[PDB]
Amino acid sequence: HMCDSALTAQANDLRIYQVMVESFVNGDDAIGHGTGYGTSHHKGDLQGIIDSLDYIESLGMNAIWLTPIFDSIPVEGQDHWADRLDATGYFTSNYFAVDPRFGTMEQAKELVEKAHEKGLYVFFDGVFGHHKDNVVPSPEGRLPVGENNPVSYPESLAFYQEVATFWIEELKIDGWRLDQAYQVPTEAWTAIRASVDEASKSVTYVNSKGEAVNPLGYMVAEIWNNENYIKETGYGAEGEPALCSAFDFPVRYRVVETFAANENGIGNKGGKWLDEGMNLHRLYPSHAQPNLMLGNHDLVRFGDLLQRGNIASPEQAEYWERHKAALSFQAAYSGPITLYYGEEIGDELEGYAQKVEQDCAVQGLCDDHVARTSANIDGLTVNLNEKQRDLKQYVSQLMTLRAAHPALSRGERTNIVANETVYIDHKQADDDALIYMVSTTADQDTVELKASDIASDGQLVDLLTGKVHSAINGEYQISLAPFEAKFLLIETPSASG
Ligand SMILES: OC[C@H]1O[C@H](O[C@H]2[C@H](O)[C@@H](O)[C@@H](O)O[C@@H]2CO)[C@H](O)[C@@H](O)[C@@H]1O
Ligand SMILES: [Ca+2]
Ligand SMILES: [Ca+2]
């Protein structure tokens, strides 16, 4: 059945902060895995997330996504690789209990309640295609069926329906990020989504505004592939929706290939490349709600990508301008967006940039986990420097701007310019029309823009600085610094646009 349309409006407003639990904040030094895949302290826990909720909210985020927190039970005599895998949460044993290296059921309850108190949605990480060999039966006596990886469908469906509704009914979480979602067939996703919607509509909590609300029931698939595969294995056909939201890996790659370079070194692209990527949204069915991230726990940090391509390093101003340009693109992107912890301060692993292959896992340096670095949370685990504070304040400005302007989060996109040096989108929702423009070049340039090309009948006003841009003979002349972004309100839109 259809993507439930109330969630659709809510989902376009999501600004999600992703935390990798084991590598985030060691809030209780008495517990923690103490080993894992990555260079972090490996003692991140639920208390550390609870300690970070004020920080996450002040960033302007309105939701948090935790990597799996369920109980990965060690088996006597298992090797250190298995010890490290237990720290990731992605090969779990008891889907219905909290891993004690992260915390207790009571602390997981406390976390969700306090997040809701502060106006944040909470999403958990559901791995419904695989698990550890010692999986334990559900409270209702169910087990997944088949191999440990991947499990068999539809034999395993009843079990994972029970998992997916349990955490909603017990903790009132607002939905699920779905790991490696193509391991679960589309018919199963339709039924799991029905279970999620039914469980969500069966409970309420009091949000920060004082209203009793159902948990969102949001579900976002991780399908690390191009649009044709995200459609085939995630969204389903037009008229027969499987899932309603999936991560926008294709545009993530276009963004890092424009403002940095990707892990394989493709980079130095321009606005034309970004536009071509956004245009491929036309391949998706009408119900698809792509979710743009710049990175995650499986991708190299943006700042390390900048160093890997010999593009920039934190000692150079351009390192920060490129972060701002990439984050500004996310802020202008309609639909849910996800920020990976540390991008807001330009994090990067000291001493690391080039790809490390031999012996990378025992070092914490493989591409697929090197971003799992100890979190730098201002006032909690770090005192930020001037450039770090400047980027974090910029991100707070973007998230605030996004919250106030429907054109950014749910506006219709019309590309105005997409060449090698600039990218200009017109965004409009109801009576909110603006221009998003971002430089894609290390050269200062002045952009000549016809008011008649953007349905502007008057001035343009910068929504962050308030600078007014007036037309002469119907044309604006806008100076763009290298990789500068501008959010320009169309103060008087034309009768027709
Ligand atoms: O030692 C093998 C392998 O383990 C890790 O890969 C994990 C990953 O960390 C988990 O998050 C999840 O995706 O499962 C993977 C195993 O299937 C290391 O990240 C990886 O480098 C290493 O080769
Ligand atoms: Ca700890
Ligand atoms: Ca580095």
Residue numbers in the entry: 0 to 496
From the publication, what sentences describe this entry?
The GH13_37 subfamily is the most recently established α-amylase subfamily. It was created on the basis of the isolation and phylogenetic analysis of a novel α-amylase, designated AmyP, from a marine metagenomic library. AmyP exhibits high substrate specificity for starch over pullulan or cyclomaltodextrins, efficiently hydrolyzing starch into glucose, maltose and maltotriose. AmyP is a raw-starch-degrading enzyme (RSDE), thus making it of potential interest in the food processing and green-fuels communities. The AmyPΔSBD is composed of A, B, and C domains and shares structural features with other GH13 α-amylases.
The crystal structure of WT AmyPΔSBD complexed with maltose was obtained through co-crystallization of full-length WT AmyP with β-cyclodextrin (β-CD), an unpreferred substrate of AmyP (AmyP/β-CD). This structure was determined to a resolution of 1.95 Å by using the AmyP-E221Q/γ-CD structure as an initial model. The structure of AmyP-E221Q/γ-CD contains electron density representing a maltotriose molecule bound to the active site and occupying subsites -1, -2 and -3, whereas the structure of AmyP/β-CD contains electron density representing a maltose molecule at subsites -2 and -3. These observations suggested that the E221Q mutant possesses activity for γ-CD and the WT enzyme possesses activity for β-CD at the high concentration in the crystallization drop, thus producing maltotriose from γ-CD and maltose from β-CD, respectively. The maltose bound to the active pocket of the WT enzyme also superimposed well at subsites -2 and -3 with the maltotriose bound to the active site of the E221Q mutant. The observed binding of maltose in subsites -2 and -3 indicated that the affinity of subsite -3 for a glucose residue is greater than that of subsite -1. The observation that G2 binds in subsites -2 and -3 indicates tighter binding in these subsites than in subsite -1, which is consistent with the production of a limit digest of G1, G2 and G3 by the enzyme. It seems likely that a strong -3 subsite would protect G3 from rapid digestion, whereas a weak -1 subsite would limit the formation of glucans smaller than G3. The AmyPΔSBD-E221Q/G3 and AmyPΔSBD/G2 structures can therefore explain the nature of the limit digest of G1, G2 and G3 by the AmyP enzyme.
